[PDB]
Structure formats: structure tokens, C-alpha cells
Amino acid sequence: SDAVTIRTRKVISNPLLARKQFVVDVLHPNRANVSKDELREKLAEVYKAEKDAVSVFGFRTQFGGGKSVGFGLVYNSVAEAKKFEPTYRLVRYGLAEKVEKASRQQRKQKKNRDKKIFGTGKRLAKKVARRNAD
Amino acid sequence: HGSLARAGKVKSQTPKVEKTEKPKKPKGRAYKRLLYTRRFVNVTLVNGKRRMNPGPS
Amino acid sequence: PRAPRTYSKTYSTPKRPYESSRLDAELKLAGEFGLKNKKEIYRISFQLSKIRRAARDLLTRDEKDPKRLFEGNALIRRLVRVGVLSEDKKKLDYVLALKVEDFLERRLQTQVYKLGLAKSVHHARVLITQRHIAVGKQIVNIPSFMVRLDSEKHIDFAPTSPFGGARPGRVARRNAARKAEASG
Amino acid sequence: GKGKPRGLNSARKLRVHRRNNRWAENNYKKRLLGTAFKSSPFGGSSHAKGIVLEKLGIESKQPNSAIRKCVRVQLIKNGKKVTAFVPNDGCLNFVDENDEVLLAGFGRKGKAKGDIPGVRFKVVKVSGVSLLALWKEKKEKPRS
RNA sequence: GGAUAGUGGCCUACCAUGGUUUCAACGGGUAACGGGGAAUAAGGGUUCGAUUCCGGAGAGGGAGCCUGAGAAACGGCUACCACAUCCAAGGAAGGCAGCAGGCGCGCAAAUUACCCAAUCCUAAUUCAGGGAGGUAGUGACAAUAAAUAACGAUACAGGGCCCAUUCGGGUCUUGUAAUUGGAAUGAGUACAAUGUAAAUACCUUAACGAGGAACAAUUGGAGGGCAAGUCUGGUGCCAGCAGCCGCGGUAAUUCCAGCUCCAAUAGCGUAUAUUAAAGUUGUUGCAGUUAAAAAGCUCGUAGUUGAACUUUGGGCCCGGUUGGCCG
Structure with missing residues (x-):
């Protein structure tokens, strides 16, 4: 974006999650908006880290365009980022994959159906088959 | 005098003249401006007292 | 469930709704300040009533009472900061002397008109709502936006607007395309 | 001494005197005895649906002379029978026999409006459709 | 003494005859869960509080009880009652006042949707579960801001007034317009990005997106209260209007309409409840000769109220305050 000059404020370091976190703002005059990739690459190069090691979120474009503010989170390693970020944000960043859990209603149906069966039910399957044949 | 039928006498007997087409009046602040010129600067409504809807005398 | 989100009304419709004197007076304000409804007049009068009620409470309070000083200082400070009051009339009784026209005069409509950006107050409102005005450097399109006593130095055309040096609008751009096509 | 105890x-x-004298106040007595709940045809409700039993013409009180158009209607929720004015020109034609109508008050709380003798309620919706909507033709009666 | 985890007529046994009440016991009604609070008020107050917080009580009624630390648990069992489901007719299985949803009831109240991303909770627990909760949908219950058009020139017609070579063009007109121009935009679509658990919206912004027939703002009203019509047509005490007074009986400022106007305006009306107005509930603050109201008169218990009098004044300092003596 034209004249991003991304600024970072309140850059407090947390060794607890081993990262540097700051309130980030981006000035994008004459351009609609800036995206996750373009934000992360610039933040990565200025903080001396890989593109994945830095995380940004919460970008609200302020009225009239011109600039937006989000939250930036640069980790001390890719492994640190992988352990600490939520899976939704990782798949948001493209590093991870969307977990294939079924819908809540189908998932809950499975729970209540298997709740009616005590134990493995392998013997029950054989018995039901024998009676159905009978 | 006296009727339970014929209810709706004049309502059905009126010769219905449809509304005449006319330029739509402005809405909102535009209408308030229209009123302001109508009742303050177009003082041409006074016959001695500031009438608002004089009859076509 | 969640804690309740509080809210309140900002205006008070008048008792005796049809005093011809009040109706004429409020229409004069509406015409000369480019207001859309009587709701704006009611809101400003409700606001003035609230400030006058607080100022009356504190003015009958004993002199150099801690509550009087603290509350009165805060009241006058925000008044002068918004500019409705004036620094020459710094004392508290002048708040009682205030009138609804004073707040209306400091509305964004009339300040745009007074700064000369507007042809009139109604032209001013159209200009504000169409995101062509800006305070500080940011587009503001609430006509009722109160201007502090320091932001008159920043009210001017929005950088995103065609009147602020931006792209030549939409209908002019369309008409320019039509002219080029007709000459093509 | 002004008659009341000052001590x-x-x-x-003073409290029991005020209690004993509150009962002469018309609306307060009605509220406490629950007459609106007990005896009023709507049981304190602002509106009530009913079936029109029959149409009626009621001659107006003096000095007026005319025949206001009303309906004897039995409420759904009580079974109480009420006369209701049909408040517009020719709307008695819209109210047929055996329709379900909505009834509202006349504004004069529990009383009779103007020249209409004893009719304390007015019809609002006929067969679920609004009277003034029918009267200005903004809606059509389903006729079913 | 039992019993209780524990006090206790909580229960048992013997005994005494006590306990509450006109300072309203007891009984009845409540269209009564209590409170923090809500509406509306000069002050006093009046009414409301099922409902987001706290505390109670219930899982259709009622009782009984297992486990556990904690249950009279009901999304746990037992029985009866009332419902109601499937049977292959012997049996079996249930409590939505959880979340959606259906019927009934009514004037009166939404989707059988997405998710654990928050806020928190629970488990053996960083990982799982959570219709708790959040998101979206429905949603004019309420509250916030605020589009429905601005600007120029001529035509139209006067007022300040350069000069009054008037009062001409009318210099600046200010308004009136079937005069005409360019300029701005959003509502809505829409690549995209952000937004999100994923989205939808919001916020941003390429492309598109005003000139009326358009992208059209209604709801009530025009006799008084209460500003707005002595205008026109129709009806002729009929129809109808009208909160009240009243309008209408062939000249309707009130009905049905047209036009014009007025009020509030994405809101406006209507019905009911309630408050101010209401000093028509009157403690502050009513009234009682005649308007409603002084018991027929006296006695009298409860209640309310009830004569004066008991240490005063004067001297002696200290130390705080408004200060002004004094800058």
C-alpha cells in the first residue's frame, strides 16, 4: 500500500509466551485496505523474523479510510508460534489445516447414540445379526 | 329519518375526483426551508395579520 | 444473561404543544440554522435545560464549597472548550444566560457556513453528509458534530473529496467519459 | 384545630383515616377491588376478539338524530355480550354476520362516547383485517 | 430422654396453665416471590418492580429415599394421583417453568440455524464437554445518529442603494417559476481487503449506481381547547363526524371528496393501565351554615393531646474562624 509506514506502539515484551506484542496501525491513503499477507511480511522484516513468526489481528478500518488499527504479535520462533497460536488463526494464516470435526448436531447425535451402547458392542452386533437372520 | 340499510349513503354517493398530479413537495430539511420562506420572508401573506391559508377571496 | 446496555433519551417534547409563539420561534431557528426536524430544537433545548439545571443547583450552593468549585469548574471548562461559552464570560451565571441559538451556532452546519466553505446552511448540510467536510484531518458526516474551540483551525474540505483534491467525483467522471466517447 | 389530629x-x-378516605376516590377503589379484572367485559385487557351476533341500529341521543351502526358481539375470552360501534362511514357493510372482530375502548374509560347510548366499545379489525384499511381500500376483506 | 451435624415442643414422657390481641391478634382476598430498582414529580409524594444482579421456591400435584461433602435432586430413583407413548396384548417407557420447536390459550411475544473464538465452568484435565454463553436469523418494545437534494445563469417581480442619468440592467436584490446547466452523493448492487470460530453485517474501496413519471414520507388535523379554510363539488338531523362543547333538517369553515394549509416526521395515530396536572387524598396541603359532609344529645375505655416551676447570670484565660487594622 502507498506509504504504509506501519507504526507499532505499546510494544511490551512477554517472555511468558516469548513474543513481542504491540498495537499496530497502518496508514493506507488512496488505497482501500491492506491484507494479512502484506501486513505480516512488512512486520516480519522490521522485527527480524520469518513471515510466520509474526501474527497480526483485530484490524478495524477507521472512518473515511486512510488508516486502520489492529493488534500485532511477533513470536520468538516458528515453533513458539505453532504452539501458541489458536488453530483458527493458524489456518487463517494458512500454516495449518481446518480440523474436520463434524457439525455440532451430528457430533452430539453420535454421542447420544453411542451412549445407548454399553461396551464395544461387538457381541451385540453378532447377536443382532443372528436374530435378524432368524 | 331512520335507516339500518343504506349505510354508506354519502360515502358511495360522492362523485370521486382523483387527486391531481403535481410536483412532489420536498422532504425533511428541504421542506422546513420551504416553510421558512413561505412564512417569514414571503411576508406577502399579511392582510393586516399573518394568515397562513387565506381563502381565495 | 449479559449486563444491561444502558441508554437514555436526549430530548423532551414540550408541554402545551401548540403555543403559536413557540412554534413560530422554533421555526425561525430551524430556518436560520438549517435543521431538519423540531427534534433537533428539542434536543438542544433539552441539553440547555440540563446544563441550566446543574448550573442553578451549583449557583445556589454555598460559595467555595468543594462540591461547587469542582463541579462548577468542570461545567464551565467543557462549556468554554466546546466554545458555546466565551472566556470573557467565565463566571457561572452566564451559563444561565445562555440560549439555544448559542449551541446551534457552534453546530458543524453553521461553523462550515461561517468558515465560508458553504453557499448556505442547507448547502452546508448537504456538504457535511456527503463526506466532503473533515475536522482534524478525518471525514466527519454528522451535522450535529460539536466543534471544540480549537478545531475551527482544522475544519476544511476532506482529502478524500473532489473538493479536497481527490479523484474527480462520479457524475463529472461519467460525463467526462461521455464527452470523450462522443468526441471519439 | 382543623379537625385532623396534629400530634x-x-x-x-392519620394513616387509617387516609385509608378510610381513600375508598371514596373513584379509580383507586376500582383498582383495589379489581372491578376491571372482575366485572369489566374485557377483564382489564385493552382489546378483545369476539363473534358478531347481529347488526344493530341505535338511535343517537339528543340533540343529535341519526342511527349509529353497532353490533352485538359475544367475546371469545369471556362469553360476555357487548354492543360495539362500527366507527366509519359504511363500515357496517364490511362487518357481516358471524365474523371475528377485534374490539377496543372508546377512549372515555368505561363510559359512552358522545351521542351513542350505552356503546362502550368499537370494532377495530374485522376477520383479522383493519377497518380503516378496508375503508380506505388499502386491504381487501378475505371474505371467508 | 430420643433425634439432629447442631440449638429448639423438633419429637417423646411427666407437669404447670399458660401464649397473641383494638399499639388490629385470628381469619379472608391479593388480579402478591422480596429487595437493588423503574416511571413521574418544586418540596412532600403516587404508582410499578414476572424480567439481565442478590436472596428464596418449583420441575404436573404430593410424598418417600438411595449415593455423596452437598439432593427431598426430578434432563435420579419409589408409590399414588392426572396425563400421555409403543406393543407382536403378555410388557415397557416419560416428565421443556433448559435450547429451538408444535398445539392450546389469548389483544399479547422469534430460528426445530452456526460455534467453543471469546466470559467463564467442570473433569483424571493446557488438548475434551458446555443450546452456560457467544454469532447470526426473526425483530418499528424501546433508545442513538440521520438520507429523501444542493448550487449557478436567464425568465419572473420588488427592496436596501453605487448614481437616484427615474425605480433603469435593477448594481447585492430576495423571493417567484414547465427555464436551463453542469457539480456531489448516498440507498442499493460489487472485484477486493479487513471483519468472523467460519461467515453475514459494520468500517474501507476499484466497477456500476438521481432529474422527477423519479430513488415519489407518511400519520393525524384545519369551529373552540389547539395554529392550520368563510375555498369548491356532493349529502341534506340521512350518511356520518365529534375525547368535551358541539356540526349535519338543500348556502356545512366540523360529514364524503378535491385543492390549499397545519402539527409531529421514519415516524404518527388508536385502546387500556399509570403519573404530573390533583390543594379531586390534602402530613406539608382540602372541605363540612346554604354547594357532599358536624352523629339527636350527653357519659366513657383504648388512642391523640395536656398549666407553670428545679443552673441563672457574672467575672478569669486559652486556643481555633471571617477577616479587616497593617499592603
């Missing part, structure tokens, strides 16, 4: 410990006498 400082006489609050009880």
Missing part, C-alpha cells in the same frame, strides 16, 4: 405520635390515626 407527633398520631401517625397511625
Whole structure:
């Protein structure tokens, strides 16, 4: 974006999650908006880290365009980022994959159906088959 | 005098003249401006007292 | 469930709704300040009533009472900061002397008109709502936006607007395309 | 002495006197006895649906002379029978036999409006459709 | 003494005859869960509080009880009652006042949707579960801001007034317009990005997106209260209007309409409840000769109220305050 000059404020370091976190703002005059990739690459190069090691979120474009503010989170390693970020944000960043859990209603149906069966039910399957044949 | 039928006498007997087409009046602040010129600067409504809807005398 | 989100009304419709004197007076304000409804007049009068009620409470309070000083200082400070009051009339009784026209005069409509950006107050409102005005450097399109006593130095055309040096609008751009096509 | 007890410990006498005199106040007595709940045809409700039993013409009180158009209607929720004015020109034609109508008050709380003798309610919706909507033709009666 | 985890007529046994009440016991009604609070008020107050917080009580009624630390648990069992489901007719299985949803009831109240991303909770627990909760949908219950058009020139017609070579063009007109121009935009679509658990919206912004027939703002009203019509046509005490007074009986400022106007305006009306107005509930603050109201008169218990009098004044300092003596 034209004249991003991304600024970072309140850059407090947390060794607890081993990262540097700051309130980030981006000035994008004459351009609609800036995206996750373009934000992360610039933040990565200025903080001396890989593109994945830095995380940004919460970008609200302020009225009239011109600039937006989000939250930036640069980790001390890719492994640190992988352990600490939520899976939704990782798949948001493209590093991870969307977990294939079924819908809540189908998932809950499975729970209540298997709740009616005590134990493995392998013997029950054989018995039901024998009676159905009978 | 006296009727339970014929209810709706004049309502059905009126010769219905449809509304005449006319330029739509402005809405909102535009209408308030229209009123302001109508009742303050177009003082041409006074016959001695500031009438608002004089009859076509 | 969640804690309740509080809210309140900002205006008070008048008792005796049809005093011809009040109706004429409020229409004069509406015409000369480019207001859309009587709701704006009611809101400003409700606001003035609230400030006058607080100022009356504190003015009958004993002199150099801690509550009087603290509350009165805060009241006058925000008044002068918004500019409705004036620094020459710094004392508290002048708040009682205030009138609804004073707040209306400091509305964004009339300040745009007074700064000369507007042809009139109604032209001013159209200009504000169409995101062509800006305070500080940011587009503001609430006509009722109160201007502090320091932001008159920043009210001017929005950088995103065609009147602020931006792209030549939409209908002019369309008409320019039509002219080029007709000459093509 | 002004007739009422002035003494400082006489609050009880003043309270019971006020209680004994509150009962002469018309709306307060109605509220406490629950007459609106007990005896009023709507049972305190602002509106009530009913079936029109029959149409009626009611001659107006003096000095007026005319025949206001009303309907004897039996409420759904009580079974009580009520006369209701059909408040517009020719709307008695819209109200047929055996329709379900909505009834509202006349504004004069529990009383009769103007020249209409004894009719304390007015019809609002006919067969679920609005009277003034029918009267200005903004809606059509389903006729079913 | 039992019993209780524990006090206790909580229960048992013997005994005494006590306990509450006109300072309203007891009984009845409540269209009564209590409170923090809500509406509306000069002050006093009046009414409301099922409902987001706290505390109670219930899982259709009622009782009984297992486990556990904690249950009279009901999304746990037992029985009866009332419902109601499937049977292959012997049996079996249930409590939505959880979340959606259906019927009934009514004037009166939404989707059988997405998710654990928050806020928190629970488990053996960083990982799982959570219709708790959040998101979206429905949603004019309420509250916030605020589009429905601005600007120029001529035509139209006067007022300040350069000069009054008037009062001409009318210099600046200010308004009136079937005069005409360019300029701005959003509502809505829409690549995209952000937004999100994923989205939808919001916020941003390429492309598109005003000139009326358009992208059209209604709801009530025009006799008084209460500003707005002595205008026109129709009806002729009929139809109808009208909160009240009243309008209408062939000249309707009130009905049905047209036009014009007025009020509030994405809101406006209507019905009911309630408050101020209401000093028509009157403690502050009513009234009682005649308007409603002084018991027929006296006695009298409860209640309310009830004569004066008991240490005063004067001297002696200290130390705080408004200060002004004094800058």
C-alpha cells in the first residue's frame, strides 16, 4: 500500500509466551485496505523474523479510510508460534489445516447414540445379526 | 329519518375526483426551508395579520 | 444473561404543544440554522435545560464549597472548550444566560457556513453528509458534530473529496467519459 | 384545630383515616377491588376478539338524530355480550354476520362516547383485517 | 430422654396453665416471590418492580429415599394421583417453568440455524464437554445518529442603494417559476481487503449506481381547547363526524371528496393501565351554615393531646474562624 509506514506502539515484551506484542496501525491513503499477507511480511522484516513468526489481528478500518488499527504479535520462533497460536488463526494464516470435526448436531447425535451402547458392542452386533437372520 | 340499510349513503354517493398530479413537495430539511420562506420572508401573506391559508377571496 | 446496555433519551417534547409563539420561534431557528426536524430544537433545548439545571443547583450552593468549585469548574471548562461559552464570560451565571441559538451556532452546519466553505446552511448540510467536510484531518458526516474551540483551525474540505483534491467525483467522471466517447 | 389530629405520635390515626378516605376516590377503589379484572367485559385487557351476533341500529341521543351502526358481539375470552360501534362511514357493510372482530375502548374509560347510548366499545379489525384499511381500500376483506 | 451435624415442643414422657390481641391478634382476598430498582414529580409524594444482579421456591400435584461433602435432586430413583407413548396384548417407557420447536390459550411475544473464538465452568484435565454463553436469523418494545437534494445563469417581480442619468440592467436584490446547466452523493448492487470460530453485517474501496413519471414520507388535523379554510363539488338531523362543547333538517369553515394549509416526521395515530396536572387524598396541603359532609344529645375505655416551676447570670484565660487594622 502507498506509504504504509506501519507504526507499532505499546510494544511490551512477554517472555511468558516469548513474543513481542504491540498495537499496530497502518496508514493506507488512496488505497482501500491492506491484507494479512502484506501486513505480516512488512512486520516480519522490521522485527527480524520469518513471515510466520509474526501474527497480526483485530484490524478495524477507521472512518473515511486512510488508516486502520489492529493488534500485532511477533513470536520468538516458528515453533513458539505453532504452539501458541489458536488453530483458527493458524489456518487463517494458512500454516495449518481446518480440523474436520463434524457439525455440532451430528457430533452430539453420535454421542447420544453411542451412549445407548454399553461396551464395544461387538457381541451385540453378532447377536443382532443372528436374530435378524432368524 | 331512520335507516339500518343504506349505510354508506354519502360515502358511495360522492362523485370521486382523483387527486391531481403535481410536483412532489420536498422532504425533511428541504421542506422546513420551504416553510421558512413561505412564512417569514414571503411576508406577502399579511392582510393586516399573518394568515397562513387565506381563502381565495 | 449479559449486563444491561444502558441508554437514555436526549430530548423532551414540550408541554402545551401548540403555543403559536413557540412554534413560530422554533421555526425561525430551524430556518436560520438549517435543521431538519423540531427534534433537533428539542434536543438542544433539552441539553440547555440540563446544563441550566446543574448550573442553578451549583449557583445556589454555598460559595467555595468543594462540591461547587469542582463541579462548577468542570461545567464551565467543557462549556468554554466546546466554545458555546466565551472566556470573557467565565463566571457561572452566564451559563444561565445562555440560549439555544448559542449551541446551534457552534453546530458543524453553521461553523462550515461561517468558515465560508458553504453557499448556505442547507448547502452546508448537504456538504457535511456527503463526506466532503473533515475536522482534524478525518471525514466527519454528522451535522450535529460539536466543534471544540480549537478545531475551527482544522475544519476544511476532506482529502478524500473532489473538493479536497481527490479523484474527480462520479457524475463529472461519467460525463467526462461521455464527452470523450462522443468526441471519439 | 382543623379537625385532623396534629400530634407527633398520631401517625397511625392519620394513616387509617387516609385509608378510610381513600375508598371514596373513584379509580383507586376500582383498582383495589379489581372491578376491571372482575366485572369489566374485557377483564382489564385493552382489546378483545369476539363473534358478531347481529347488526344493530341505535338511535343517537339528543340533540343529535341519526342511527349509529353497532353490533352485538359475544367475546371469545369471556362469553360476555357487548354492543360495539362500527366507527366509519359504511363500515357496517364490511362487518357481516358471524365474523371475528377485534374490539377496543372508546377512549372515555368505561363510559359512552358522545351521542351513542350505552356503546362502550368499537370494532377495530374485522376477520383479522383493519377497518380503516378496508375503508380506505388499502386491504381487501378475505371474505371467508 | 430420643433425634439432629447442631440449638429448639423438633419429637417423646411427666407437669404447670399458660401464649397473641383494638399499639388490629385470628381469619379472608391479593388480579402478591422480596429487595437493588423503574416511571413521574418544586418540596412532600403516587404508582410499578414476572424480567439481565442478590436472596428464596418449583420441575404436573404430593410424598418417600438411595449415593455423596452437598439432593427431598426430578434432563435420579419409589408409590399414588392426572396425563400421555409403543406393543407382536403378555410388557415397557416419560416428565421443556433448559435450547429451538408444535398445539392450546389469548389483544399479547422469534430460528426445530452456526460455534467453543471469546466470559467463564467442570473433569483424571493446557488438548475434551458446555443450546452456560457467544454469532447470526426473526425483530418499528424501546433508545442513538440521520438520507429523501444542493448550487449557478436567464425568465419572473420588488427592496436596501453605487448614481437616484427615474425605480433603469435593477448594481447585492430576495423571493417567484414547465427555464436551463453542469457539480456531489448516498440507498442499493460489487472485484477486493479487513471483519468472523467460519461467515453475514459494520468500517474501507476499484466497477456500476438521481432529474422527477423519479430513488415519489407518511400519520393525524384545519369551529373552540389547539395554529392550520368563510375555498369548491356532493349529502341534506340521512350518511356520518365529534375525547368535551358541539356540526349535519338543500348556502356545512366540523360529514364524503378535491385543492390549499397545519402539527409531529421514519415516524404518527388508536385502546387500556399509570403519573404530573390533583390543594379531586390534602402530613406539608382540602372541605363540612346554604354547594357532599358536624352523629339527636350527653357519659366513657383504648388512642391523640395536656398549666407553670428545679443552673441563672457574672467575672478569669486559652486556643481555633471571617477577616479587616497593617499592603
